[PDB]
Curated annotation (Swiss-Prot), chain A:
InterPro entries: Ald_DH/histidinol_DH, Ald_DH_C, Ald_DH_N, Aldehyde_DH_dom, HotDog_dom_sf, MaoC-like_dom, PaaN-DH. One of its GO terms (biological process) is phenylacetate catabolic process. Residues 455-483 are annotated as: Disordered. This is Bifunctional protein PaaZ. GO terms for molecular function: enoyl-CoA hydratase activity; ether hydrolase activity; hydrolase activity, acting on acid carbon-carbon bonds, in ketonic substances; identical protein binding; oxidoreductase activity, acting on CH or CH2 groups, NAD or NADP as acceptor; oxidoreductase activity, acting on the aldehyde or oxo group of donors, NAD or NADP as acceptor. It comes from Escherichia coli (strain K12).
Length: 678, 63, 63, 63
């Protein structure tokens, strides 16, 4: 039963030197894996010539809708994935975090995209940048999709989450993906790829899968492609100097092994709740997935006094963890994935012991039994700041080292001695301690959890990367960045500054910008349905002359008797030099000048985005408004009965009688559409 | 009356009945202005200018 | 504000500058209403209903 | 308040209860003014003057 690869649209396999996938618990070889003789160049050319233009023709809203449909279809079929994850050595909670975290990543990126990305194939990321006096020359930054293919070389830790946390921003960015999982657990990636492909939900050529070796694929990549790697540091650093990748300047992101720490604060004493939640946190991070996640705690740093109490409590809670076959009721932590992995963990543990670490709880495994079980291992380091191997050696299993600190600053130095980590945790009750810790140690950590009694109730964990937070770190952790919300989407696009006149930039952006040509229609823009509106549709309102009576009436009705409006004496020695009109009255009277009263397509306002009061408005001044439709964004119908709407941003400009702007802002609205799309 | 905004969701009982809210509601800008009225200190002091309002969302209708 | 009539001859000094009058004037309907306010007796009496206005001309602008 | 007309049919609940309408009603002149506020176009245009009203009858009371 050889595991197939999905490239060039065909499920196929290879022939030659294979590799076997064994069952983590029983030890039997239940899959063999090979991809020799497969045409990698044809697979890349298939991804780029038909997958990429298909994905690039969709708007960001359509791609977010596709992510959501795929997430739902994957969610329905999750039982198959759970049954396959059983073969990897995982309890049901571990498989839960993997499966449902991957699918939740899809759902989160779908929501984020549909909520924040333009209804277009281009993405203007900032506002218009003015670059001249008269306004004929400006610039803004645009993001467009790269034309190549994204190759994702994943690790065995999270065969589903690791694929989907990269796949979601890749598609949202408009790029096809070629996925190469780790051979040791590729059977679980294959089934998810088959679900996605047999759903018919995604364009053709938008997903490819290489089970086995990548062959000469990297030699065929050009500068419009991207590569991501998760795994050991030697393999990643070898890929980073691949001659083709360096010659063509192909973006390369590496994520490697890190020594994640967990510091206990000096303020913490054993009679506090922080002590108990610290113990629980260390143990959960040590034993989830048998400590096989890249964010598992490897270094425990406590104050010198607390050392013996902490070491009592850790082994106490850690002896009640039953290692065994999770199919048997009573097991709380399963096996590693391989006898090879178990050998590597034992060999790292032996390195640490030879480098001067004392065993507090079992460190020797059964190097001949069938299942790849390892006992929870807790080590001790008596001399932390002269034993360099404890900050460099990472045993990829249920293994951690306890070590003592001093004076609340030695602990910071110890935390930073990791050389760059993915995740760190500080258990404390004092906010000043947490501030000092962040200020000193954020530069060597990608993510830091401050864990006190209040956050502990809903905290997601030290080891769980959330889709909205960056996942990565400097130095030993690889230097890469993932999962930062839309930051990860931008990793698959090109940022380009575009200079020109505001009308050219408005046409390039498909959004109206300041100083661009408008169009007037003698039909009020509020009477138009979403489809009949265009960016740049504009209305000049009639005028309203400000009076002292307006200042008085507004101040009375609102209750705002600030001296700059109601006190002639105090206003005389202000910067304006006399009484002025309220900013909020300019806002309200502008709404009064442009809002169409009758029932129409405009449903709600609900939003005002960036208001600045430029110049004072005085009694005797006369204001006039221009209302220009600035940006449109369709909203997908989530049902069959909800009324189809879209979001329209409107630029508002308030001028006085010298044509000088006195207020600038934008309003958001909901505008009914004529045609829904179920 | 003072602002000139006679949008039907505030001034037309019939049309407001078949809106999503289901009746007439208060203007968002009046909630804004009355909030300023509740918190602004009137006398001369260290505060010199407002000049800016940064990210306003109207969450729930006020009746 | 109360009536909703923001015709430029009353509310826009720039447009009223090049009107026939040359400045902002008072609404004719407010002249009518203020006149009613000046002559109408408030308390219960023999006058029962008003119900009618017959031939109204506005002769000269009120400033 | 603004016009000064405090005829009991609008401002006195006790006297209005004993009237033909049976409760307080809206001023006819306010119906006239608010109607002008509903139909008058504010901005500069072809309409130059108003100056005249011809045959006003108040048919039904407005509550």
């Amino acid at each position: 039963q050889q595991l197939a690869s999905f490239l060039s649209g065909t499920w196929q396999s290879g022939r030659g030197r294979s590799r076997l996938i064994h069952h983590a618990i029983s030890g039997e070889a239940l899959w063999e894996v090979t991809s020799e003789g497969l045409d990698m160049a044809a697979a890349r050319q298939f991804a780029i010539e038909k997958g990429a233009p298909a994905l690039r023709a969709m708007t960001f809203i359509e791609r977010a809708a596709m992510l959501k449909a795929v997430a739902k279809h994957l969610l329905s079929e999750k039982e198959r994935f759970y049954a396959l994850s059983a073969q990897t050595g995982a309890t049901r909670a571990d498989s839960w975090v993997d499966i449902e975290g991957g699918i939740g990543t899809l759902f989160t990126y779908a929501s984020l995209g549909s909520r924040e990305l333009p209804d277009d194939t281009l993405w203007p990321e900032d506002e218009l940048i003015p670059l001249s006096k008269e306004g004929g020359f400006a610039a803004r930054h645009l993001l467009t999709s790269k034309s190549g293919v994204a190759v994702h070389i994943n690790a065995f830790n999270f065969p589903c989450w690791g694929m989907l946390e990269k796949l979601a921003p890749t598609w949202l960015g408009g790029m096809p993906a070629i996925i190469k999982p780790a051979t040791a657990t590729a059977q679980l990636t294959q089934a998810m790829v088959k679900s996605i492909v047999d759903s018919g939900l995604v364009p053709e050529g938008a997903i490819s899968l290489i089970c086995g070796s990548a062959g000469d694929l990297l030699d065929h990549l050009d500068s419009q492609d991207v590569v991501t790697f998760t795994g050991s540091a030697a393999t990643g650093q070898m890929l980073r100097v691949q001659p083709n990748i360096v010659a063509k300047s192909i973006p390369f992101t590496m994520e490697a092994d890190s020594l994640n720490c967990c510091v206990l604060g000096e303020d913490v004493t054993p009679d506090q709740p922080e002590f108990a939640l610290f113990i629980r946190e260390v143990v959960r991070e040590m034993t989830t997935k048998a400590g096989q996640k890249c964010t598992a705690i490897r270094r425990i740093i406590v104050p010198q006094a607390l050392v013996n109490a902490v070491s009592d409590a850790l082994v106490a809670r850690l002896q009640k963890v039953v290692v065994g076959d999770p199919a048997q009721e009573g097991v709380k932590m399963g096996a590693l994935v391989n006898a090879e992995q178990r050998a590597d963990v034992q060999e790292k543990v032996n390195i640490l012991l030879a480098a001067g670490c004392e065993i507090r709880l079992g460190g020797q495994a059964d190097l001949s039994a069938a299942g790849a079980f390892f006992p929870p291992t807790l080590l001790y380091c008596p001399q932390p700041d002269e034993t360099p191997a404890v900050h460099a050696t990472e045993a990829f299993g249920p293994v951690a080292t306890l070590m003592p600190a001093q004076n609340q600053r030695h602990a910071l130095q110890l935390a930073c001695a990791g050389g760059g980590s993915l995740a760190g945790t500080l258990v404390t009750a004092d906010p000043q301690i947490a501030r000092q810790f962040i200020a000193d140690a954020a530069r060597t950590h990608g993510r830091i959890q401050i864990l006190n009694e209040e956050s502990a109730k809903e905290s997601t964990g030290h080891g769980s990367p959330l889709p909205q937070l960056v996942h990565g770190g400097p130095g030993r952790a690889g230097g890469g960045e993932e999962l930062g919300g839309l930051r990860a989407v931008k990793h698959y696009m090109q940022r380009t500054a575009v200079q020109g006149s505001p009308t050219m930039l408005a046409a390039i952006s498909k959004q109206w910008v300041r100083g661009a040509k408008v169009e007037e229609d003698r039909i009020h823009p509020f009477r138009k349905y979403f489809e009949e509106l265009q960016p740049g549709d504009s209305l000049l309102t009639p005028r309203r002359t400000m009076t002292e009576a307006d200042i008085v009436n507004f101040a009375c009705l609102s209750g705002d008797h600030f001296y700059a409006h109601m006190d002639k004496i105090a206003a005389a020695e202000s910067i304006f030099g006399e009484r002025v009109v309220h900013g909020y009255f300019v806002l309200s009277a502008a709404a009064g000048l442009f809002v169409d009263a009758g029932v129409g397509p405009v449903i709600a306002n609900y939003g005002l985005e960036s208001l600045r009061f430029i110049e004072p408005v005085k009694p005797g001044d006369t204001i006039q408004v221009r209302l220009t439709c600035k940006r449109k964004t369709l909203k997908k119908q989530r049902s069959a009965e909800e009324k189809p709407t879209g979001v329209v941003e409107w630029a508002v400009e308030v001028f006085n009688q010298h044509q000088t702007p006195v207020a600038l802002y934008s309003i958001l609205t909901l505008v009914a559409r004529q045609h829904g799309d179920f």
